[PDB]
Amino acid sequence: SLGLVDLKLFHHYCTEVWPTIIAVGISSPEVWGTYLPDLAFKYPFLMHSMLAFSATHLSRTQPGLDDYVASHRLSALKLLREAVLEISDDNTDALVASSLILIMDSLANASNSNPTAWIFHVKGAVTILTAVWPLPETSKFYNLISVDIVDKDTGTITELVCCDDDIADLYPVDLDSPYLITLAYLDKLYREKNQLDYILRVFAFPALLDRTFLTLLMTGDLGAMRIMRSYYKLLRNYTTEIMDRAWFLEGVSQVLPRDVDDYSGGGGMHMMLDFLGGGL
Amino acid sequence: LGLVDLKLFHHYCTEVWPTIIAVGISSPEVWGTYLPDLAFKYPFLMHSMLAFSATHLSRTQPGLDDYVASHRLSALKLLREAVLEISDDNTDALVASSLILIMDSLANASNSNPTAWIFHVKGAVTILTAVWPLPETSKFYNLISVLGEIVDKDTGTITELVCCDDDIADLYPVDLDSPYLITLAYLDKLYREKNQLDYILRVFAFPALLDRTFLTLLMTGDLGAMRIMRSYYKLLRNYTTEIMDRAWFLEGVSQVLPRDVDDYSGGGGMHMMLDFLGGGL
Numbered sequence: 001s002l003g004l005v006d007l008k009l010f011h012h013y014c015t016e017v018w019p020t021i022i023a024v025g026i027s028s029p030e031v032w033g034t035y036l037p038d039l040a041f042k043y044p045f046l047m048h049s050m051l052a053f054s055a056t057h058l059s060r061t062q063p064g065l066d067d068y069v070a071s072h073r074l075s076a077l078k079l080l081r082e083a084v085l086e087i088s089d090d091n092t093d094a095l096v097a098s099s100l101i102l103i104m105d106s107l108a109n110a111s112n113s114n115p116t117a118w119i120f121h122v123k124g125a126v127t128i129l130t131a132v133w134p135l136p137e138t139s140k141f142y143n144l145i146s147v148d149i150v151d152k153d154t155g156t157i158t159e160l161v162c163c164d165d166d167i168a169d170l171y172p173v174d175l176d177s178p179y180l181i182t183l184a185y186l187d188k189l190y191r192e193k194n195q196l197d198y199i200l201r202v203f204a205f206p207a208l209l210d211r212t213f214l215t216l217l218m219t220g221d222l223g224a225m226r227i228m229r230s231y232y233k234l235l236r237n238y239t240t241e242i243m244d245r246a247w248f249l250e251g252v253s254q255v256l257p258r259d260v261d262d263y264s265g266g267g268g269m270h271m272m273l274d275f276l277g278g279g280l
Numbered sequence: 281l282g283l284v285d286l287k288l289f290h291h292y293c294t295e296v297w298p299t300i301i302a303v304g305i306s307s308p309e310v311w312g313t314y315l316p317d318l319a320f321k322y323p324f325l326m327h328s329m330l331a332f333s334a335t336h337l338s339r340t341q342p343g344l345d346d347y348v349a350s351h352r353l354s355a356l357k358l359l360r361e362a363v364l365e366i367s368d369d370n371t372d373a374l375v376a377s378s379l380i381l382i383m384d385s386l387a388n389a390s391n392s393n394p395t396a397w398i399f400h401v402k403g404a405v406t407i408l409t410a411v412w413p414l415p416e417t418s419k420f421y422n423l424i425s426v427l428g429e430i431v432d433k434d435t436g437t438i439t440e441l442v443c444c445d446d447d448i449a450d451l452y453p454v455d456l457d458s459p460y461l462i463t464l465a466y467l468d469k470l471y472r473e474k475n476q477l478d479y480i481l482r483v484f485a486f487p488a489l490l491d492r493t494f495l496t497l498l499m500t501g502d503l504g505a506m507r508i509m510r511s512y513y514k515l516l517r518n519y520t521t522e523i524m525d526r527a528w529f530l531e532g533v534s535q536v537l538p539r540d541v542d543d544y545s546g547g548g549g550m551h552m553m554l555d556f557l558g559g560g561l
């Protein structure tokens with residue numbers, strides 16, 4: 001059930017929006033400019049994500065679209081949360097796709113805005129992504145990850161270039177460690193900053209933690225939490241440095257504090273819970 | 281409108297207008313940027329465009345017969361309502377849904393179609409007639425239009441032409457006092473531009489850009505004017521069959537345009553003329 005302004009919003013995407021996605025350092029003009037729009041006709045959930053996104057961008061020059069943005073994001077979150085209950089295999093790329101769009105769009109819509117609303121939308125997208133990962137290798141979206149150096153001359157990580165002084169206490173780490181996988185993931189992603197789709201790898205990281213680590217993290221374990229603070233230093237610094245490059249990362253410095261203790265919704269432990277957790 | 285309407289606007293932008301350019305038309309800026317943008321300001325242009333692209337998608341996807349017909353009449357209705365209040369701001373909107381509706385009508389006239397495609401074309405033509413002359417500032421100005429060189433410089437008369445020479449010998453010498461001079465020069469110049477870009481659109485606009493003197497003269501059934509239009513008809517018909525092989529929406533137009541106008545499925549040649557020319561005042 002749509003109007004004339006939706007045709008325009010979709011024209012605004014195929015026309016102007018997705019070139020800006022490519023421009024910040026994403027790959028595949030074919031997925032973003034061809035595959036997505038086609039999938040959108042099949043999955044209302046991705047369609048509502050795409051329209052909300054392009055109306056957020058249009059809000060930049062055309063006035064009067066604040067309710068489109070708001071209303072479309074909501075439908076997208078709703079349809080997206082309902083869609084996760086029944087995951088098929090033909091709707092998997094469409095979910096991944098709308099998840100990433102909802103992330104870009106929520107970071108763009110973080111005016112300050114509590115930040116509970118933007119955080120809540122991102123949460124949904126993290127739960128959808130967590131849900132569908134791992135992706136078949138058949139997925140055109142199976143380059144939002146990385147392959148997987150750590151451990152040397154004693155068979156236990158002794159040094160990581162990713163942060164080195166941020167997890168020292170943990171050093172050294174056994175191959176048995178539950179922290180191993182994440183640390184390798186995180187370090188390997190870090191030595192990948194000068195490459196295409198880095199922004200999307202950085203984006204997907206919280207959803208691609210192994211369940212062991214994650215279930216461990218939600219108990220508030222200190223090692224894991226220290227580990228994630230390293231991811232956070234990477235995310236925040238990568239984001240605030242490219243604000244001029246990406247229109248939708250603008251003002252992200254104002255919504256992501258330096259010290260997680262300064263989280264506006266509570267404490268660091270609260271800032272983890274607002275971002276992680278699906279809905280069983 | 282709904283989701284199909286969106287997929288359709290999307291279809292236009294991805295596959296319909298590149299085929300318009302491909303036939304021998306210039307300015308991709310008008311057909312893929314200017315029009316879509318105007319389509320948002322003017323619902324009559326919008327319906328024209330969704331009907332066109334659904335006609336083009338109809339060739340493969342089935343079930344849009346309803347879509348094609350619904351958007352085509354609605355465009356006519358608003359287009360026809362829109363000629364009563366022309367402005368300089370909606371004039372290119374009007375020109376462009378005229379040519380769209382013209383192409384969409386040629387694509388929808390069948391192996392043996394009736395008078396519906398023609399009805400629409402008549403509407404397109406009468407809009408066109410009402411907005412011409414376009415201001416030179418219009419983007420469509422060079423796209424749909426275009427003297428002494430037709431005259432023989434040693435006799436002072438139109439001793440001979442290309443294109444219609446055998447067809448209208450009886451008319452010769454044509455003096456500059458004649459009311460057939462502007463049309464004959466226009467037709468000769470139209471022939472003197474075939475390999476050039478936008479020829480199809482010049483050929484298309486010709487009936488709407490006759491001067492009123494000639495036209496009012498033609499609607500009285502005057503034999504001279506009329507023989508002349510038969511020359512335009514030989515040119516329109518002759519071009520469409522060769523480029524029917526190179527353009528999807530001119531397919532089967534020979535089945536609907538007879539070599540003898542006397543074989544008009546609706547009447548005599550004077551009826552074929554009346555069903556294409558004429559307006560609402």
Ligand SMILES: CC(C)[C@@H](C)/C=C/[C@@H](C)[C@H]1CC[C@H]2C3=CC=C4C[C@@H](O)CC[C@]4(C)[C@H]3CC[C@]12C
Nearest residue numbers: 122203206225228229232260268269271272275
């Ligand atoms: C914006 C998109 C990319 C989504 C996916 C990322 C959100 C970030 C801000 C979220 C994802 C995981 C969250 C996260 C996980 C774990 C902890 C450990 C805790 O002791 C302090 C908060 C902290 C560190 C939080 C901070 C906020 C994080 C880093």
Ligand SMILES: CC(C)[C@@H](C)/C=C/[C@@H](C)[C@H]1CC[C@H]2C3=CC=C4C[C@@H](O)CC[C@]4(C)[C@H]3CC[C@]12C
Nearest residue numbers: 405484487506509510513541549550552553556
């Ligand atoms: C298809 C689009 C391009 C529209 C504009 C053109 C329609 C054509 C087929 C119409 C336009 C003018 C019509 C036309 C005008 C005048 C006469 C004179 C008459 O004694 C015989 C019919 C005849 C020759 C008709 C035949 C059909 C014509 C040539």
